[PDB]
């Protein structure tokens, strides 16, 4: 319900007067509404909005090569320890 959101409920850090640096990108405007998750994106939208106040703008926009880049290729480690003992055909222990 904060006034820092738009009439659509989107929060724009660039429009936040109490935030230094905005959204951290000088070229793009970033907004967020309701806890999305880019670890599982179910809905993808590309579109055109207007910024001309007293105008009706027309034109064509091409979108190309929507892609992910800069793979996080840090590795990982694993370690396994196995202790298998048998006691004179009476007992067997196997620890992992």
């Amino acid at each position: 319900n904060s006034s820092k959101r738009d009439v659509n409920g989107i929060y724009y850090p660039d429009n936040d007067p109490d935030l230094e640096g905005g959204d951290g990108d000088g070229k793009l405007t970033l907004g967020i509404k309701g806890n999305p998750n880019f670890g599982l994106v179910r809905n993808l939208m590309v579109g055109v909005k207007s910024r001309a106040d007293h105008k009706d703008i027309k034109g064509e926009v091409w979108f190309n090569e929507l892609r992910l880049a800069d793979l996080e290729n840090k590795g990982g480690m694993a370690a396994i320890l196995n202790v298998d003992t048998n006691m004179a055909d009476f007992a067997t222990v196997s620890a992992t």
Partner: protein, 528 residues
């Protein structure tokens, strides 16, 4: 794409309504023979390769260099498309030759030669395999067509006209009487409707299989056309032309059994009487083995509903990109011809958005059941040949988002904003009039091996066009996709964007249009 330029799939159309179900422009509401009074002659075909490879007697090299008869190669229409060696290198265009001054089949107009040719129509229709346009996301009708006012056999500039497309439920009653004609049920020993139904003989029995037998006598008695009359009793019905050898104008002629040029030989190739000769060695060779039936989607039922959308295309000498649904024009400067000469040519690409019909006829509200497709030419003064180098229904994987995106607007289905989504290719839009399509810097065409041949893959971008009234200050138009993508293992999301102004429109300025990506679990509650 779904290809629609198969000539054998098209059949003679019923008389169309033009603006509404209450419009008798072509006498579509008439319950008499007048229903067929405005039908002019139309031939639809694909020129047989025998005309180009082994020239038949009476066909010269001049007959094969006209821009209406010449063989079209893929490298002319698609200069950037790689074809593997030994595969199909020619484009098999769908040719529609329209004679507005000549009588169409089953036309009994007493005064047809004194009527205005531009008031006539010539039409064909077709069944659609997939009928749910919404589920399939059928976005537009795309066709590449040769400009008929440029080439060697160019039409006079005064011969301008219109091509109409109808999508939806279109009546299958070609000869409107409420009865389904099927000529495999005709014959002297068969029961007919006791009072003749105004066009000729209709079998009284219920049809079972749309097939002839192989008895030549039965074939002669059965393959008599959609009117059910063997050209000897047609004068009783078609009284204004009883003195002619073919009163109904439905006789079939094989294109190798005719004389003249290529166009003249296909003039009667679509006649329904005599087009199913039993023997393939007949001088009047068949061109089909199926009986002519007033049931086009082959569900045994003749539909009579007329609820469909109308789209229209102007055909004028000097059309340009940006109007008349034109998206691209490719000019061909020096076409080599079999007669040793050269000619100019112009290919025009039309993209008619299905979601924006020009008119509605009858009671159709959505695109969930689109069963029939019709196209008819009208308004032309003289003979006009239209060659579809491509004719497809194009469906997209990106769906237009309907419903408001900004709460300020609160009026989604209004404001008259034309919002279109299509694609721009390197293989089809390298000569696009405002901006030729090129790949973004660093982007290369993928290369594969078809059969010891290097094939460059197509490079495509998604094009969104905003026109008409235009976009309000904070309004937006978007397309969307249902995906399942994990981005957590990558650091950057990247995209190429391009902006251009529409032709014949006020120029778009910098930082007026904003390109946005909205991604998440939905577009209204949880998104970046």
């Amino acid at each position: 794409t779904i290809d629609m330029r198969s000539a054998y799939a098209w059949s003679l159309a019923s008389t169309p309504f033009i603006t509404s179900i209450n419009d008798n422009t072509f006498n579509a509401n008439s319950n008499t023979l007048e229903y067929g009074f405005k039908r002019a002659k139309l031939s639809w075909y694909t020129i047989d390769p025998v005309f180009y490879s082994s020239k038949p007697s009476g066909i010269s090299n001049d007959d094969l260099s006209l821009n209406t008869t010449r063989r079209i190669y893929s490298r002319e229409l698609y200069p950037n498309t790689d074809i593997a060696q030994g595969q199909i290198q020619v484009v098999n265009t769908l040719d529609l030759t329209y004679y507005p001054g000549e009588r169409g089949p089953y036309n009994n107009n007493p005064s047809f030669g004194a009527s205005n040719p531009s008031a006539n129509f010539g039409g064909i229709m077709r069944a659609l395999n997939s009928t749910n346009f919404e589920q399939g996301n059928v976005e537009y009708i795309q066709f590449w067509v040769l400009d008929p006012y440029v080439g060697n056999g160019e039409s006079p500039a005064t011969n301008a006209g219109k091509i109409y497309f109808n999508l939806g439920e279109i009546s299958e009653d070609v000869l409107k009487d409420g009865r389904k004609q099927y000529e495999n049920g005709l014959g002297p020993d068969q029961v007919m409707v006791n009072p003749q139904p105004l066009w000729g003989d209709v079998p009284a029995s219920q049809s079972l299989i749309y097939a002839f037998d192989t008895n030549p006598d039965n074939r002669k008695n059965q393959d008599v056309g959609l009117d059910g009359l063997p050209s000897s009793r047609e004068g009783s019905i078609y009284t204004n032309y009883a003195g002619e050898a073919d009163p109904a104008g439905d006789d079939y002629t094989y294109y190798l059994n005719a004389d003249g040029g290529v166009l003249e030989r296909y003039k009667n190739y679509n006649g329904t009487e005599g087009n199913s000769a039993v023997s393939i060695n007949d001088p009047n060779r068949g061109s089909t083995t199926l009986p002519d039936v007033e049931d086009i989607n082959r569900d045994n039922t003749m539909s009579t509903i007329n609820a469909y959308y109308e789209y229209s295309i102007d055909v004028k000498p000097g059309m340009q990109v940006g109007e008349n649904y034109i998206t691209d024009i490719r000019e061909v400067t020096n076409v080599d011809l079999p007669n040793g000469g050269t000619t100019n040519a112009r290919w025009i690409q039309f993209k008619i958005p299905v979601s924006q019909p020009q008119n509605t006829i009858g009671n159709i509200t959505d695109f969930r059941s689109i069963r029939f497709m019709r196209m008819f030419m009208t308004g032309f003064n003289s003979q006009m040949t239209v060659r579809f180098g491509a004719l497809d229904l194009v469906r997209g994987e990106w769906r237009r988002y309907t419903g408001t995106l900004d709460a300020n607007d609160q009026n989604p289905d209004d404001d008259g904003v034309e919002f279109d989504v299509a694609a721009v290719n390197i293989q089809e839009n390298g000569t696009k009039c405002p901006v030729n399509y090129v790949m973004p810097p660093g982007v290369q065409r993928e290369q594969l091996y078809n059969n010891n041949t290097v094939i460059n893959q197509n490079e495509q971008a998604l094009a969104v066009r905003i026109g008409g009234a235009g976009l309000q200050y904070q309004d937006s138009r978007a397309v969307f996709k249902n995906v399942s993508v994990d981005m957590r293992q990558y650091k950057k999301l990247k995209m190429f964007l391009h902006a251009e102004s529409l032709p014949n429109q006020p120029t778009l300025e910098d930082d007026e249009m904003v390109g946005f990506i909205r991604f998440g679990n939905d577009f209204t509650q949880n998104f970046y």
